Amino acid sequence: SSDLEQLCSHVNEKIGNIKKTLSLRNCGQEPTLKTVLNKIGDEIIVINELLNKLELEIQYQEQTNNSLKELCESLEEDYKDIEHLK
Amino acid sequence: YARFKPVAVEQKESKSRICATVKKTMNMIQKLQKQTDLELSPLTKEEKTAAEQF
Amino acid sequence: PIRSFCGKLRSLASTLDCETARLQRALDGEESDFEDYPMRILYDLHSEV
Amino acid sequence: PIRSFCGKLRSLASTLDCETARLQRALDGEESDFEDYPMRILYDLHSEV
Amino acid sequence: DPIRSFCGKLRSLASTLDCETARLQRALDGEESDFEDYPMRILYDLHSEV
Amino acid sequence: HMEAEVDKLELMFQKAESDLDYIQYRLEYEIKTNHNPVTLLKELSVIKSRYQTL
Amino acid sequence: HMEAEVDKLELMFQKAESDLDYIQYRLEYEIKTNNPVTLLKELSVIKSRYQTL
Amino acid sequence: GHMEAEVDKLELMFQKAESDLDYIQYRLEYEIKTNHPVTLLKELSVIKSRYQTL
Amino acid sequence: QTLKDDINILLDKARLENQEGIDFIKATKVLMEKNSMDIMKIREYFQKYG
C-alpha cells in the first residue's frame, strides 16, 4: 500500500464517516424520514404480535391434526372389525 | 411456515382417509338396508356434515 | 469489514457521479471551472515568460 | 475489465444468496443435505470402527 | 484452526460449484424462474427510465 | 445515483450478515437448551495406536 | 437476490462507461472540425540559454 | 495413497464439474447459433446527452 | 408491509386448518352416531327377523 493510496483511504474514511453521521442526523431530525422510520418501527410491533398468534395457531393446529389422526386410527380398527365379520 | 406445511398435509391425509372409511361403512349399510327392508333419514345436522365429506 | 469494501466501491461511484455530471457541462460550456482555471495558470505562465 | 470486478462481487452474492437460503432450511429441518450426508460419513466412520 | 481455514475456502468453492451447476442446468431447461424473472424486473426499470 | 445504488448494496450485505447472525444465534440457543465427534477422533487415534503398537 | 442487485450495478457501470465514452467521442469530433505541448519545450530552450549566457 | 486417494477423488469430481459446466455452455451456444442489449446501452447514452446539450 | 401481509396471510390459513379440522371431527362424529344406529338397527333385525 503506497503513501498515495493510504492517503486516499484516509480521505474516503473521513468522507464516508461524515455521510453516515449525516444520515444519522437526517433520520433523527428531518420529519418525513422520521415518520417512515416510525411507521416501520410500529409495523414491526404488529408483525411481531402476528407471530405469537401464528405460534398458538400452530400448536393448536397440530393438536387437532393429532386428534384428527387419533380419530382416524380408531376408525380403521372398528371397520377392519366390520370388514372381517360382515 | 415450515412448522406448518406438513401439519397442513397430514390433516388432508387423516381427512381423506376418514372420508374413505365412512364412505365404505356407509355402503355396507345401503347394501344391507336394500337386502332387507327397514328405513331412516340423515336428518339435517347429519347431511349438513355430509357436505363436508363431499 | 463490509462497509470497508463498499466505502471503496462507493468512492468509485461518487467519482463516477460527480465527474460525468461536470464533464457533460464542460462539454456544453457551463461549469466554469474548465475555462476559469486554465486561464489562471496560462496567465501565470505568461507572467513567468 | 468491468465485469472482472463484478464477477468476483457476483460470486460473493450468489454465495450469500444460496447459503442463506439453505442454512435457514437446515435450521428448520428441511433441505435434507444436512441430516443425509453427516449420516453417510458417520456410517463410513462406523464401518471403519 | 489452520486445518479448516484451508477447507473453509475449499468448501466455498465447492458449495459454489454445487449450487450454480444445479441452477444453471435448470435455467438452461427453463425452470428456476430467477433467470426470466429478474432480467424482466431490471428491463422494466430500464423501460421506466426511458 | 451509482453512489445511491451502492448504498443499497451495502445495505443488503448488512442484512445478509444479520440474517446469518440470527441463524447462528438460534442454533446456539438450541444447543444450550436441551442438554461429540471431537474426542471420538482422538480416541480412534488412541486405539489405532494402542492396537498396532501391541 | 443480491446477484440480481449486482447485475444492476454492473449494468449501471457499463452505462457510465458509454456515457464517458460519448463525451469523449464528441470532444474528439469537436477538435476535428477545427498547442501548450511544444510551448513547454521552447520555454526550456530559452531558460537554458539565458542561464548559459 | 490414502488421503492421496481421497484427493484423487476430489480432483476427479472437480474435473467433472468443469465438463458439466462446459456442456451447459456448449448447449447454450448451440441454441443461439441456430438463428442469427449491448448496442442499446450505447444508443441510450447519445440521447440522454442530446437532451442535456439542447 | 408485504412481509406483514404474508405473515398475516399464513396465520389465516392456519386459523382455518384448525377449523376445517375442528369441525370435521364433529361432522364425522355425527355420521358415527348415524351409522352406529344403522348397524344396531340392522343387528337387532337379523337376530330376530321380526
For every residue of I19-46, DSSP letters joined together read HHHHHHHHHHHHHHHHHHHHHHHHHHHH
Within 8 A by CB and 6+ apart from A33, the residues are: A26, A27
Angle at F39 between CA F27 and CA F48, to 5 degrees: 145
CA distance F9 to F7: 6
Show the beta-strand stretches assigned E in chain D: none
- Cα F20 to Cα A3, D18, F33, H41: the distances in Å are 37, 12, 20, 37
Q: Is any Cβ of chain D less than 8 angstroms from the Cβ of E12?
A: yes
User: Which three-class secondary structure string do you get for B1-54?
Assistant: CCCCHHHHHHHHHHHHHHHHHHHHHHHHHHHHHHHCCCCCCCCCHHHHHHHHCC
Q: Are the beta carbons of G11 and E42 closer than 8 angstroms?
A: yes
DSSP A30: S
DSSP D1: -
Q: Which three cell numbers stand for residue G15?
A: 452505462
Burial of E24 (0-12, 13-18, 19+ CB in 10 A): middle
> F48: alpha, beta or left, given left = phi > 0 and alpha = psi -120 to 50?
alpha
Q: Is C37 helix (H, G, I), strand (E, B) or coil?
A: helix
Neighbours of B25 (CB within 10 A): 20
Q: Is any Cβ of chain G less than 8 angstroms from the Cβ of H49?
A: yes
Q: Helices D3-28 and F2-33, interaxial angle, to 10°?
A: 30
Q: Is any Cβ of chain D less than 8 angstroms from the Cβ of F48?
A: no
Domains of chain A, by residue range, sit at 1-86
Q: Are the beta carbons of A50 and A44 closer than 8 angstroms?
A: no
**Per-position b or e across G10-28, b if 16+ CB within 10 A of its CB:** bbbbbbbbbbbebbeebee
Q: Is any Cβ of chain H less than 8 angstroms from the Cβ of E40?
A: no
Q: How many CB pairs under 8 A join E and H?
A: 13
Neighbours of I28 (CB within 10 A): 21
Architecture of the domain delimited by A1-86: Helix non-globular (6.10)
Q: Is any Cβ of chain D less than 8 angstroms from the Cβ of B7?
A: no
Q: Do G22 and H44 touch (CB under 8 A)?
A: no
Place of cell 443480491: G2
Which of B26, B32, B52 is nearest residue I42 as measured by Cβ atoms?
B32
CA distance G6 to C10: 14
Q: Chain G residues with CB inside 8 Å of H49's CB? A: 19, 22-23, 26
Q: Are the beta carbons of C33 and F40 closer than 8 angstroms?
A: no
Q: Chain G residues with CB inside 8 Å of C24's CB? A: 23
Counting as contact any 3 or more CB pairs under 8 A, the partners of D are: B, E, F, G
Q: Are the beta carbons of F44 and G48 closer than 8 angstroms?
A: no
Q: Is any Cβ of chain D less than 8 angstroms from the Cβ of B2?
A: yes
Name residue I34's amino acid. Answer: K
CA distance A61 to A48: 20
- Cα I12 to Cα A58, A61, E40, F4: the distances in Å are 11, 12, 32, 38
Q: Do I4 and A50 touch (CB under 8 A)?
A: yes
Question: Which chain D residue lies closest to F16 (C-alpha atoms)?
Answer: D16
Q: Is A50 helix (H, G, I), strand (E, B) or coil?
A: helix
CA distance E27 to H24: 10
Name residue D29's amino acid. Answer: G
